[PDB]
Design an enzyme around this catalytic site. Sequence first.
Site, mmCIF file in Angstrom:
data_model
loop_
_atom_site.group_PDB
_atom_site.id
_atom_site.type_symbol
_atom_site.label_atom_id
_atom_site.label_comp_id
_atom_site.label_asym_id
_atom_site.label_seq_id
_atom_site.Cartn_x
_atom_site.Cartn_y
_atom_site.Cartn_z
ATOM 1 N N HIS A 33 0.893 -1.226 -0.022
ATOM 2 C CA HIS A 33 0.044 0.080 0.110
ATOM 3 C C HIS A 33 0.866 1.095 0.041
ATOM 4 O O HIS A 33 0.444 2.123 -0.274
ATOM 5 C CB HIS A 33 -0.956 0.097 1.238
ATOM 6 C CG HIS A 33 -2.037 -0.859 1.206
ATOM 7 N ND1 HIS A 33 -2.019 -2.075 2.332
ATOM 8 C CD2 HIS A 33 -3.118 -1.299 0.308
ATOM 9 C CE1 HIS A 33 -3.089 -2.915 1.827
ATOM 10 N NE2 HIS A 33 -3.670 -2.517 0.768
ATOM 11 N N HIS A 48 4.944 6.688 6.573
ATOM 12 C CA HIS A 48 4.799 6.296 5.248
ATOM 13 C C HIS A 48 4.327 7.556 4.261
ATOM 14 O O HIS A 48 4.229 8.482 4.832
ATOM 15 C CB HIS A 48 3.832 5.184 5.222
ATOM 16 C CG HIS A 48 2.363 5.649 5.731
ATOM 17 N ND1 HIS A 48 2.256 5.872 6.990
ATOM 18 C CD2 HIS A 48 1.328 6.317 5.010
ATOM 19 C CE1 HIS A 48 0.952 6.452 6.974
ATOM 20 N NE2 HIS A 48 0.477 6.681 5.717
ATOM 21 N N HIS A 77 1.909 8.950 0.725
ATOM 22 C CA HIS A 77 1.079 8.752 -0.283
ATOM 23 C C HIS A 77 1.508 9.732 -1.697
ATOM 24 O O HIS A 77 1.849 10.760 -1.476
ATOM 25 C CB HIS A 77 -0.173 9.355 0.148
ATOM 26 C CG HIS A 77 -0.821 8.482 1.420
ATOM 27 N ND1 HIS A 77 -1.281 7.423 1.153
ATOM 28 C CD2 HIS A 77 -0.462 8.879 2.666
ATOM 29 C CE1 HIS A 77 -1.733 7.099 2.690
ATOM 30 N NE2 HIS A 77 -1.247 7.880 3.432
ATOM 31 N N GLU A 136 -3.011 13.484 0.179
ATOM 32 C CA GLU A 136 -4.306 13.079 0.586
ATOM 33 C C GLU A 136 -4.967 14.466 1.009
ATOM 34 O O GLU A 136 -5.957 14.775 0.505
ATOM 35 C CB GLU A 136 -4.135 12.072 1.725
ATOM 36 C CG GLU A 136 -3.684 10.812 1.131
ATOM 37 C CD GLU A 136 -4.203 9.718 2.192
ATOM 38 O OE1 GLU A 136 -4.073 9.599 3.104
ATOM 39 O OE2 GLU A 136 -4.438 8.613 1.411
ATOM 40 N N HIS A 168 3.272 10.890 6.281
ATOM 41 C CA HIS A 168 2.329 10.716 7.308
ATOM 42 C C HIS A 168 3.270 10.164 8.595
ATOM 43 O O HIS A 168 3.858 9.010 8.321
ATOM 44 C CB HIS A 168 1.187 9.816 7.002
ATOM 45 C CG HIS A 168 0.290 10.546 6.303
ATOM 46 N ND1 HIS A 168 -0.738 9.767 5.591
ATOM 47 C CD2 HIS A 168 -0.051 12.065 6.369
ATOM 48 C CE1 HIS A 168 -1.662 10.646 5.193
ATOM 49 N NE2 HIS A 168 -1.343 11.925 5.369
ATOM 50 N N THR A 221 -6.782 7.134 7.002
ATOM 51 C CA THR A 221 -7.180 7.289 5.712
ATOM 52 C C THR A 221 -7.036 5.854 4.855
ATOM 53 O O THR A 221 -7.129 5.871 3.791
ATOM 54 C CB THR A 221 -6.233 8.411 4.916
ATOM 55 O OG1 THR A 221 -4.925 7.877 4.499
ATOM 56 C CG2 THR A 221 -6.367 9.742 5.672
ATOM 57 N N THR A 222 -6.797 4.887 5.497
ATOM 58 C CA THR A 222 -7.048 3.504 4.982
ATOM 59 C C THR A 222 -7.755 2.662 5.715
ATOM 60 O O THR A 222 -8.047 3.075 6.876
ATOM 61 C CB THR A 222 -5.435 2.903 5.035
ATOM 62 O OG1 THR A 222 -5.149 2.504 6.529
ATOM 63 C CG2 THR A 222 -4.531 3.658 4.317
HETATM 64 N N1 LIG Z 1 -2.642 7.162 6.309
HETATM 65 S S1 LIG Z 1 -2.673 7.329 8.085
HETATM 66 O O1 LIG Z 1 -4.236 7.446 8.378
HETATM 67 O O2 LIG Z 1 -1.769 8.122 8.331
HETATM 68 C C1 LIG Z 1 -2.205 5.678 8.553
HETATM 69 C C2 LIG Z 1 -2.336 5.511 9.926
HETATM 70 C C3 LIG Z 1 -2.006 4.218 10.476
HETATM 71 C C4 LIG Z 1 -1.784 2.957 9.496
HETATM 72 C C5 LIG Z 1 -1.548 1.878 10.327
HETATM 73 O O3 LIG Z 1 -0.708 1.554 11.052
HETATM 74 N N2 LIG Z 1 -1.902 0.796 9.471
HETATM 75 C C6 LIG Z 1 -2.996 0.619 8.907
HETATM 76 C C7 LIG Z 1 -4.249 0.343 9.945
HETATM 77 C C8 LIG Z 1 -4.124 -1.030 10.399
HETATM 78 O O4 LIG Z 1 -4.056 -2.045 9.462
HETATM 79 C C9 LIG Z 1 -5.154 -1.643 11.378
HETATM 80 C C10 LIG Z 1 -5.801 -2.549 11.241
HETATM 81 C C11 LIG Z 1 -6.668 -3.131 12.185
HETATM 82 C C12 LIG Z 1 -7.077 -2.082 13.321
HETATM 83 C C13 LIG Z 1 -6.348 -1.271 13.369
HETATM 84 C C14 LIG Z 1 -5.273 -0.618 12.393
HETATM 85 C C15 LIG Z 1 -2.514 -0.990 11.074
HETATM 86 C C16 LIG Z 1 -1.502 -0.539 10.305
HETATM 87 C C17 LIG Z 1 -1.943 3.501 8.331
HETATM 88 C C18 LIG Z 1 -2.104 4.505 7.699
HETATM 89 ZN ZN LIG Z 2 -0.968 7.840 5.412
#
Ligand SMILES: NS(=O)(=O)c1ccc(C(=O)N2CCC(O)(c3ccccc3)CC2)cc1
Ligand SMILES: [Zn+2]
Length: 258
Positions: free
Chosen positions: A60, A90, A92, A102, A115, A195-196
């Site tokens: 991603h 990370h 975008h 974003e 981010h 945002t994911t």
């Molecule tokens: N772009 S963003 O909003 O800045 C963002 C923030 C955290 C993450 C992250 O740490 N990820 C995504 C969510 C994640 O998959 C998850 C899954 C289930 C419950 C809680 C978090 C954990 C890993 C990714 C993007």
């Molecule tokens: Zn992000």
Amino acid sequence: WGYGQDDGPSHWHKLYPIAQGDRQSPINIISSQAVYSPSLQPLELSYEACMSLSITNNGHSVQVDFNDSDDRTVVTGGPLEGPYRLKQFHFHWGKKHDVGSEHTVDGKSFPSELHLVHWNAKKYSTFGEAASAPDGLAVVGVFLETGDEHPSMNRLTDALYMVRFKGTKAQFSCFNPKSLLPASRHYWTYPGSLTTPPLSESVTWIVLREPISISERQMGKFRSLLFTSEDDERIHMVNNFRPPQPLKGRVVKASFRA
Ligand SMILES: NS(=O)(=O)c1ccc(C(=O)N2CCC(O)(c3ccccc3)CC2)cc1
Ligand SMILES: [Zn+2]
């Protein structure tokens, strides 16, 4: 889910209904509508130089993870009532200069957005646990514009080749995330969400006013990454961003006067 024609952002609501919630991110920041809030304390990003662990292509984005055992890399101040530990950062990005970020400002997109994801380890046992609570996360967003080469960024863009394929990781020691911050600490803040997927509304967003710049050659290293694995039809990792979402009456505060 993904960022393709079939599983992209416009379809996420079909799997995660909260995609249509009341505090979704990102948003279009209308500078004139932002409320100047002098009450907010100074935003401080206190980062250590050797807290980084690895760099990973997770399909991603490309993400640098950090040791978050204590408070050696935290964000504090601004709208935050306490310190949040940096878990990872990370990016975008788009396929052209006019698209990729974003968040947008007055309708303007930047070619990329960084981010820095922090969590409230003071009131939550795991990053995952925090990711589900309204006061669980604090993400600092930094816009990247293309122009002059960014010296520190080379350390990271040089490392991309080895993680060009989805599911590959590499050791990435002693990279100080402070090296990717602008000389200004002015920001916009609002209550939002991841945002994911799962798109949980647990994020206090802090979007820095000033973008940092990297060279087009550097930006090109990001577009060289692949959404796909080594033994698959190569699909370049581009346009891995979610578009602005409805503000729904939320208040955007600014630490400065436009
Ligand atoms: N772009 S963003 O909003 O800045 C963002 C923030 C955290 C993450 C992250 O740490 N990820 C995504 C969510 C994640 O998959 C998850 C899954 C289930 C419950 C809680 C978090 C954990 C890993 C990714 C993007
Ligand atoms: Zn992000």
